[PDB]
Amino acid sequence: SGEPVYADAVLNGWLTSMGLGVEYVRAEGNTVYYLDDEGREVPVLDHACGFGSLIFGHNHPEIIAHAKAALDAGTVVHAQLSRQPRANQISRILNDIMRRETGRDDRYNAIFANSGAEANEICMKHAELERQERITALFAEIDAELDTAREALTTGTATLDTASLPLDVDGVIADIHRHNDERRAERPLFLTLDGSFHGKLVGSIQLTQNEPWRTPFTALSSPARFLPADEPELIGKIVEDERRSVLTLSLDKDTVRVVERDFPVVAAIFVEPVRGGSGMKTVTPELAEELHRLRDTLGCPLVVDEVQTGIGRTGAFFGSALLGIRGDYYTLAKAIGGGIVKNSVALIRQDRFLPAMEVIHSSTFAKDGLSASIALKVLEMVEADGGRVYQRVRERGQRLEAMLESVRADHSDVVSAVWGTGLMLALELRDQSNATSQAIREKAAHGFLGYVLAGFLLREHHIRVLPAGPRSGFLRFSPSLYITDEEIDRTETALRSLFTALRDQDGDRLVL
């Protein structure tokens, strides 16, 4: 209509036209409820689950009860600049878990924040502290090399070689200082994988491939180079083209030369163990070895974003441990809030950790007492009974993956693949840009196909699926570890129904 609206007009307009215009009024385990026209609750199976936030489902009774107990105990939520031992206690548990799963006896400092993106930006900031340490060291050495060369050229023990000048003593040194100062002030680069998703704040958005989400904001912040994960022979040459030089004077016996030395341009490499923005593709061993090489070569940290793959989703606590990704920094977020509060953590290896970070970084809401308590509960639950929860994820993941595989095998004309691991899975949809049906074709063309297919699943089978990937070309399946055999069977029926409709090009049934 034409009445005043104060939020979400465009978002709601667009959700309605996709068939996703529903208000969920209540949620319990793997079920969200909307009201029909008569005001009765209609149960919907949730495969989205806060984009993998709800490993234990919606409003887990043990988490709700813990939260209520912490509220009634008068938990100190706001205790800024006082002792909060729970931060140390959480970091200790995460350290013990990482040692168990990797067999490495490595120690990590924890910095807390309020979202996945804030945790990735603590890592970007710390990576840049490390880069400024390397730069200070390099520039101190260059000053000493310049002083030494200036001794040998004035004293008279050496001659300037004029073949090097395409890069008078005092004038050449001032031209070097100018060149070097320009280089020093240039923005660094981050390296990501193609399809990368690392958040949407001013810094983190540059690390997210999705072109409409990022390219309006290019001018604001340091960019990333999106390395091709599938073609990792081309990564070496792409990173090689980003080499940059500072100048110094090199004294060898009686000849002084202007020479190029390497400048640290790359602040950090980011990687998701399972690539959310890419349709849940797992990092292959070949790509892991290439990211290890780049980290060893450039001397910048490798940051492992486990915002989505952490707290058990993959069948281990850390998906990095499962896939052999050997990171310097790790980030966690989604499941650590128990599906009720907001919390995130950067783990930074203690032998790289710059203690200035503990006093120059802060946030009003970070390390709050309520999300600290709930974190310790979530970690108790995921660790309980000698790690049977991870075994439950692996066994539920296998059941759900096998079902999605059984559907692909009979629907390979519209389903190109199953991707992911544990309970972080996706179907890849074949391109429908040449679809017989105009309505399907137009939606594929605008990048809206997955959204439309999700509407079908909602209105005809009462199943909530959300798409992933850049043109909604993937369907996400990230339910809780309590997903039942009967819910997996109902999803199978729904998907055969959906993919039979798609084979038949039934635009009247699929598109509203």
Ligand X SMILES: Cc1ncc(COP(=O)(O)O)c(/C=N/[C@@H](CCCNC(=N)N)C(=O)O)c1O
Q: Pick out the residues of the known binding site for pyridoxal 5'-phosphate.
A: 116-117, 305, 308, 364
Q: Which of residues 149-208 bind a second copy (CB under 8 A)?
A: 185-188, 199-205
Q: Which of 454, 346, 289 is nearest to 122 (CA)?
A: 346
Q: Residue 219 binds which entry of ligand X, a second copy, none, with Cβ cut-offs from 5 to 8 Å by kind? A: a second copy
Binding site as annotated, residues: 116-117, 305, 308, 364
**Shortest Å, Cβ 124 to ligand X:** 12
**CA geometry: angle 16, 45, 61, nearest 5 deg:** 120
Q: Which of residues 22-81 bind ligand X (CB under 6 A)?
A: 51
Buried b (16+ CB within 10 A) or exposed e, 107-127: ebbbbbbbbbbbbbbbbbbbb
Backbone angles phi, psi at 420, to 5 degrees: 115, -170
**Shortest Å, Cβ 11 to a second copy:** 5
**Shortest Å, Cβ 254 to ligand X:** 56
Q: Which of residues 61-100 bind a second copy (CB under 8 A)?
A: 64, 67-68, 71-85, 87-88, 90-92, 94-95
Angle, helices 369-410 vs 485-503, to 10°: value is 50
Query: Which CB atom, from 259 or from 512, has the smaller least distance to a second copy?
Result: 512
Query: Which CB atom, from 120 or from 248, has the smaller least distance to ligand X?
Result: 120
Q: Residue 461 binds which entry of a second copy, ligand X, none, with Cβ cut-offs from 5 to 8 Å by kind? A: none
Interface with ligand X by CB under 6 A: which range of 137-145, 164-172, 192-200, 384-392? 192-200
The answer to the question of residue 1 lying near a second copy (CB under 8 A) is no
Q: Residue 409 binds which entry of a second copy, ligand X, none, with Cβ cut-offs from 5 to 8 Å by kind? A: none
Rounded Cα gap, residues 378 and 373, in angstroms: 9
Inter-CA distances, 299 with 35, 294, 328, Å: 56, 8, 11
Interface residue with ligand X among 264, 276, 450, 473 (CB under 6 A) is: 276
Cβ distance 282 to 323 under 8 Å? yes
The answer to the question of residue 381 lying near a second copy (CB under 8 A) is no
**Shortest Å, Cβ 55 to ligand X:** 14
Interface residue with ligand X among 19, 57, 116, 397 (CB under 6 A) is: 116
The answer to the question of residue 214 lying near ligand X (CB under 6 A) is no
User: Hey, what are 435's tokens?
Assistant: 């679809």
The answer to the question of residue 14 lying near ligand X (CB under 6 A) is no
The answer to the question of residue 363 lying near a second copy (CB under 8 A) is yes
Q: Which of 272, 333, 271 is nearest to 115 (CA)?
A: 333
Task: Please report the sign of the dihedral spanned by the C-alpha atoms of residue 420, residue 423, residue 424, residue 430.
Answer: positive
Residue 129 burial (10 A CB sphere; 0-12, 13-18, 19+): middle
**CA geometry: angle 461, 466, 470, nearest 5 deg:** 140
Query: Which CB atom, from 200 or from 392, has the smaller least distance to ligand X?
Result: 200
The answer to the question of residue 361 lying near a second copy (CB under 8 A) is yes
The answer to the question of residue 95 lying near ligand X (CB under 6 A) is no
Position 333: which residue type? Answer: A
- Site size toward ligand X (CB under 6 A) is 21
User: DSSP assignment, residue 29?
Assistant: B
Q: Which of residues 288-327 bind ligand X (CB under 6 A)?
A: 305, 307-308
Residue nearest to ligand X (CB): 116
Other C-beta atoms lying within 10 Å of the C-beta of residue 106: 15
Query: Which CB atom, from 28 or from 230, has the smaller least distance to a second copy?
Result: 28
Buried b (16+ CB within 10 A) or exposed e, 175-189: ebeeebeeeeeeebb
Interface residue with ligand X among 277, 310, 470, 473 (CB under 6 A) is: 277
Terminal-to-terminal C-alpha distance of the chain = 19
Measured torsion, CA atoms of residues 437, 440, 443, 448, in degrees rounded to the nearest 10: -170
The answer to the question of residue 264 lying near ligand X (CB under 6 A) is no
**Shortest Å, Cβ 362 to ligand X:** 4
Interface residue with ligand X among 162, 215, 364, 434 (CB under 6 A) is: 364
Cβ distance 245 to 234 under 8 Å? no
- Lay out the site mask for a second copy across 459-498 (x = CB under 8 A, - = otherwise): -------x--------------------------------
Residues that bind ligand X (CB under 6 A): 51, 115-117, 120, 197-200, 272, 276-277, 305, 307-308, 333, 362-365, 468
